């Protein structure tokens, strides 16, 4: 009985589609091949003797489409800003989404900084420290996630649902 609009922000290849597909369908490309797209989902969740119905809006992450994003995040109760821990430019871009969301919407939004592909070791380029520190100073929370192994996928959405004003 609690409706929430949730935007997914982040640049191409970060794992936006993978994250929400894991969360919604319990699927990942390596184990279960494709069935439906992932730009929009409605998903219900139980939190502390209640219910949250997430309406999940994906956004185009390419730079040429950046100026269109306010149309998507308008009135969102929440946002997951996704970055790929193996890609430093993705993290720089995730930081810009956060500042913009703070500048140009919307005071009681629940923002979650997701650091995805955590399963990847050799290739990791963004420290949990930088991401954690950044989040701690900007009123949001950082969670490392993996769509591949399902680590912290369900948890990050619960943790947003927990915080809904």
């Amino acid at each position: 009985s609690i409706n929430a609009k949730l935007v997914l922000l982040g640049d191409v290849g970060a794992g936006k589609s993978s994250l929400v597909l894991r969360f919604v369908k319990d699927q990942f490309v390596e184990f279960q091949e494709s069935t439906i797209g992932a730009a929009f989902f409605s998903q219900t969740l139980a939190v502390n003797d209640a219910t949250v119905k997430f309406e999940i809006w994906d956004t185009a992450g390419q730079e040429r489409y950046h100026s269109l994003a306010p149309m998507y995040y308008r009135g969102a109760a929440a946002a997951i800003i996704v970055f790929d821990v193996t890609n430093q430019a993705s993290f720089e871009r995730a930081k810009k989404w956060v500042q913009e969301l703070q500048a140009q919407g919307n005071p009681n939004m629940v923002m979650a900084l997701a650091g995805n592909k955590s399963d990847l070791l050799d290739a990791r380029k963004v420290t949990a420290e930088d991401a954690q520190t950044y989040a701690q100073e900007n009123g949001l929370f950082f969670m490392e996630t993996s769509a591949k192994t399902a680590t912290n996928v369900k948890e990050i959405f619960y943790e947003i649902a927990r915080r809904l004003p």
Partner: protein
């Protein structure tokens, strides 16, 4: 509504239609009056001792029936009915009539893995049907159909190229390309009319998401220059010149 019992419901709608002429045309005022009227007549369908009665689905169909009847009557007064909407339609048509001639999928970051070889022809055509209809719902359905077609075609491309499921990163650029290629007349006015006059309770959910995608497409397209489609300054202007010549 042709039933002798519905007499005063018919008189109520008809007197709304004529009492709508009495005020000078104003979009933001007009659409408030229409939605208020829709809300009130909706309430009068469900609350009616005679109508209690219909299933929820049937009541929803009567709402769309009402929307179609009323908007068809009010169409010329409320659709593209001022100079700035006429100007914006023409600017958008002009820009697309040129850009369609040289734009390619890579200009919009569409990856070769998500190429369709009809160039999503069926989606183009679904969008172009938009000026075949006067009801906001039937206009919106063309948009939604276009989007569903694009989505199924993107899904097929990811099946064939063993890729991950497509998201907004795939969908939006393809919606932009498809809209440029289809160049549906009065696209600006059509979107404004749907946004203003579609039964407000129904511009929600997945419908609202895809609607927002096409509004963002309109905006991108209006603002196309050399940089936004990744062409050199001189290449873009040269492309525009040849486009005007044909």
């Amino acid at each position: 509504m042709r039933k002798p019992s519905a007499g005063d419901f018919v008189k109520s709608i008809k007197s709304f239609i004529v009492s709508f002429s009495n005020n000078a045309p104003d979009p933001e005022k007009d659409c408030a009056m229409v939605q208020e009227f829709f809300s009130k007549m909706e309430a009068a369908f469900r609350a009616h001792p005679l109508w209690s009665g219909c299933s929820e689905e049937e009541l929803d169909s009567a709402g769309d029936g009402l929307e179609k009847y009323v908007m068809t009557k009010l169409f010329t007064r409320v659709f593209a009915s001022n100079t700035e909407e006429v100007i914006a339609d023409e600017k958008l048509f002009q820009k697309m009539s040129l850009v369609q001639q040289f734009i390619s999928p890579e200009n919009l970051d569409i990856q070769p893995t998500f190429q369709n070889e009809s160039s999503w022809l069926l989606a183009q055509k679904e969008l172009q049907k938009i000026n075949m209809y006067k009801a906001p719902r039937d206009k919106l359905v063309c948009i939604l159909n276009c989007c569903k077609v694009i989505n199924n075609l993107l899904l097929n491309a990811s099946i064939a190229s063993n890729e991950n499921a497509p998201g907004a990163d795939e969908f939006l650029p393809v919606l932009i390309y498809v809209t440029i290629k289809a160049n549906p007349p009065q696209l600006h006015s059509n979107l404004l009319y749907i946004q203003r006059y579609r039964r407000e309770s129904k511009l929600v959910g997945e419908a609202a998401y895809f609607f927002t995608n096409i509004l963002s497409a309109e905006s991108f397209i209006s603002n196309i220059d050399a940089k936004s489609i990744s062409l050199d300054e001189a290449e873009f202007e040269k492309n525009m010149e040849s486009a005007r010549a044909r």
